[PDB]
Amino acid sequence: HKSEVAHRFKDLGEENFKALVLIAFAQYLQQCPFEDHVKLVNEVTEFAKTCVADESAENCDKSLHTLFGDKLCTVATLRETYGEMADCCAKQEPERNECFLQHKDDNPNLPRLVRPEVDVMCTAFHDNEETFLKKYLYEIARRHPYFYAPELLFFAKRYKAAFTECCQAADKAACLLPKLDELRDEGKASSAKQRLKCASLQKFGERAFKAWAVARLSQRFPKAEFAEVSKLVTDLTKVHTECCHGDLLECADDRADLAKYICENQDSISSKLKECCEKPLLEKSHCIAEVENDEMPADLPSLAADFVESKDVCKNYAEAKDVFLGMFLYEYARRHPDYSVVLLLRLAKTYETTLEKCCAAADPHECYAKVFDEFKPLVEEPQNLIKQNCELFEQLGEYKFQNALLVRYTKKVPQVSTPTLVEVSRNLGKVGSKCCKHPEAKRMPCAEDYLSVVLNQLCVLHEKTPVSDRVTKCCTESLVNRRPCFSALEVDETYVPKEFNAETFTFHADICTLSEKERQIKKQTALVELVKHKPKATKEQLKAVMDDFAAFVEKCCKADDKETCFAEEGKKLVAASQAALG
Ligand SMILES: CC(=O)C[C@H](c1ccccc1)c1c(O)c2ccccc2oc1=O
Ligand SMILES: CCCCCCCCCCCCCC(=O)O
Ligand SMILES: CCCCCCCCCCCCCC(=O)O
Ligand SMILES: CCCCCCCCCCCCCC(=O)O
Ligand SMILES: CCCCCCCCCCCCCC(=O)O
Ligand SMILES: CCCCCCCCCCCCCC(=O)O
Ligand SMILES: CCCCCCCCCCCCCC(=O)O
Known part of the structure; x- marks a missing residue:
């Protein structure tokens, strides 16, 4: 039309408009305080209302990039707080926005966000619902500069929903907590897949990407003609190239047109796109990207x-x-x-x-x-791995199943750091309880989806502080041989066992007075260390010690003087165990 903002404001809605604008500014000006962003939002919203009323009004003719860039350069502490970025304001629009993109610090040094107590959260939510949601929409966006804005909005609404439902519940924490932990994981997984898709598109190139897409889209739309799928794979390639570049506006329109194209050709693609095509602009493409296979x-x-x-x-x-x-x-x-x-x-x-x-x-x-x-x-090969591992997980539970993977992987790469092993194994476990839940028909796709982020996570860490050539090999291999390469790792015959450290195997009463998660991690940590000390221990020998320990804990977390029990009996456990493990 004659006015971009006006148009965007109209087919988006005031509420959605103000939320996205906040996200966009928080993703560029990651250092400015909350109160400052809220002001900019109000100012842009006001301006937008002006254009909705009169498309011929001043500046309403300017483009979104232009308008967005002019307000960014408005910030007075720009040069003093962002340095180089401020020199972006000196260029002509086309390069100005390009300049701003180059300075979007992908990972700033902000403190980890700590989860306050359920009662303080719920009360804050009731006192001022709006700033409570925006404040966190803001804290998340500034830390994740590349998270596609609209999706972040989709997570915001799920968080509002968890508070609505739970803050009224009898037992708040039993309701809210598990939902929040659920949101976090899905959020971190979505973020990882986004970064991964871009990483792959850069390393392996366009051809590999297009191949991944054809396969994926063919399972999804099995009735579509090949020429139709090629058409969509082509546009999807353009879409992700731009979205990976980081330009939100550019990204958003390409996705919109595509979602538009798919719905109009709905009958010639998939029959299950009905619902998704009914939903509003903001949600179409998100829905379509997640639709069930036809x-x-x-x-x-x-x-x-x-x-x-x-x-x-x-x-x-x-x-x-x-x-x-x-x-x-x-x-x-x-x-x-x-x-x-x-x-x-x-x-x-x-x-x-x-x-x-x-x-x-x-x-x-x-x-x-x-x-x-x-x-x-x-x-x-992948099928046998799926049934073998799911059977086992059905026998043992998620926790004891995590312990098995723990012994298996510590033995294969003893060089890796203990806390890293513990985390990676715990996550492998989750993929087990998530995916083994499905019928054999949807299992392989399930594991691939989750395993891909966990293996990428694993690699990144290892990239920082490399420790094993073997791991580096698999991590630098083709994304198609990645998982098979880790599957092929065998016990390390080389590794020289860590020498005994009395402390590493000393336990106190704290373990009695801790939460489930923390107890396990404490136990799981001693277990990795055990294997690193005696990597030749038999599944049997090892299970023998784990049984004594299992009890030992009990005996002391149920005995009067706990302080000494963990000290007198602990002397015994350690001594006997060493005798059995030679
Ligand atoms: C993780 C996914 O399976 C998303 C999917 C896809 C398919 C092939 C290569 C990359 C991503 C996907 C989209 O990213 C998309 C974006 C805009 C509009 C429609 C879309 O449809 C989709 O299936
Ligand atoms: C997530 C985007 C919407 C913002 C609303 C989040 C409200 C819940 C606050 C908890 C976030 C802290 C993250 C965590 O769970 O560790
Ligand atoms: C438009 C069709 C393009 C798809 C090309 C098919 C190529 C299939 C080869 C398998 C790709 C494995 C990835 C790789 O080795 O780079
Ligand atoms: C300065 C104007 C800021 C406008 C905010 C960007 C508009 C977002 C529109 C996104 C539409 C959803 C498209 C999609 O992903 O399917
Ligand atoms: C399925 C839950 C058990 C956890 C272990 C994952 C086992 C699945 C391995 C197969 C991976 C499929 C991806 C691929 O084709 O390489
Ligand atoms: C923390 C570094 C340890 C590395 C552990 C390797 C991760 C295993 C992922 C491969 C899953 C397929 C299961 C298998 O074949 O073992
Ligand atoms: C030679 C040192 C002997 C002490 C070994 C400590 C035992 C560490 C494994 C603890 C995990 C047990 C599993 C569990 O019951 O949850």
Whole structure:
């Protein structure tokens, strides 16, 4: 139209508009105080109301970037607090915004956000609901400069909902706490996937990304024509390139147009897009990106017809390699919603290696005639891992299951830091209780989703303070061999056991007076240290000690003079245990 703000204000709503503007400013001016951002918000909202009333009013013709950039340069302490960034204000708009993007500190040094007591939170919420939500919308956004703004809004509303429901509940904490812990994890996971998708698009390039997308989109929209999926994969590539660059406005419009395109062609893509297409602007694309897989056509041919048997396969492949390979993916992915995306990529990659060496020899048709038998071991490997590990988790519980993984991984990379091992294992455990809950049909996709962030988390840490070549190998390998590389790690035969430290195995009464989470972590910590000291301990020998300890604790956290029990009996435990572990 004639006025951008006016238009955005109208099909967004005053409430949503003010929240997004706050997020946007908090993501650039990460150092300014809350009271300051609220003022800017009010000022931009007022200005916006002016344009809604009269599209010809002053400045209402200016573009969003221009308007956004002029207000940013308004801040007086800009140069004194942000330094270089202030020199951005000296350039012509096109470069000005580009300049601002370059200075968006992805990770500032702000104190960790501490969760206050349920009672102080609930009371604050009742006293002033609005500033309570905005204050935290602000604290989160400033710490996560690249989190796509609208999604952050979606999390804000889920937090408001948890307070509404829980602050009225009889037992506040039993209600609110678990919901908040739930929100945090999903929030941190969403943030990790976002950063990951951008990282991958930079390291491995466009082709790899497009392949991941074709597979993913084909499972989702199995009824769509290949030309339709290619079309969407193309736009999705543009969309994420821009969104990764960090330009919110640019990102938002590309996503909007795409969401618009999909809904208008709704019948030619998926039947399950009905709901999502009914929702308002702000929510369309979010919904679509999360929609359930549609049902695959009941009448689908065998892949071997067009990709193995049919002579002249090499003719179609040489005609246009990636297109053909893309069609392979499309066809294979839409018949297998139960496969993880990387598995599909492994299959596609195997096919490529085959067609490459087979199309350059005597009788092609017979060289690549087998290929589908190449897939079997590839498909079964992740499947066996899934059932083996889920069975085990059903036997032991989440906690005792975490302990098993703990012993297994400490033995494979004893060089890693204990607190790192404890965290990684605990998270591997969660993926276990989250995913083993699903029918075998939705398991592999479930693990892939969660395992991808945990493995990326693991790598980043390790990147900071490297400790094992093996870990570095897997972490720098192709994103398709990442998990398989960690799966292939074997017990470290080299490792020289840590020498005994009396303290490391000394326990007091505090452990009795602690919470579940903290008790476990205390126990789990001693367990990693144990294995590092005697890495040759048998699952049996080890289980023997864990049983004595299990009791030992009990005996002392139920005995009169606890101070000495943990000291007299502790002497015994440690001494005996060492005797049994040689
Ligand atoms: C994590 C996801 O599976 C999101 C999905 C996707 C598919 C292929 C490559 C990357 C991401 C996805 C979107 O990011 C999206 C954004 C705007 C509009 C529609 C969208 O649809 C989608 O399926
Ligand atoms: C999350 C975006 C919306 C802001 C509302 C958050 C309100 C809950 C406050 C708790 C946040 C502290 C994070 C944590 O759980 O450790
Ligand atoms: C438009 C179609 C583009 C898709 C290209 C298909 C390529 C399949 C190869 C598998 C990719 C594995 C990733 C990699 O090795 O880089
Ligand atoms: C200075 C004007 C600030 C305007 C704030 C940006 C507008 C956000 C619109 C996002 C629309 C949702 C699109 C989508 O992701 O599906
Ligand atoms: C499923 C819960 C158990 C936790 C252990 C994860 C086991 C799944 C491993 C398979 C990973 C699928 C991704 C891939 O294809 O490599
Ligand atoms: C904290 C560093 C220790 C590294 C632990 C490796 C993480 C294991 C992830 C691989 C999951 C597949 C399960 C398996 O095959 O073992
Ligand atoms: C040689 C030192 C002997 C002491 C060993 C301490 C035992 C550490 C493992 C504790 C974990 C037990 C598992 C549990 O019951 O939760």
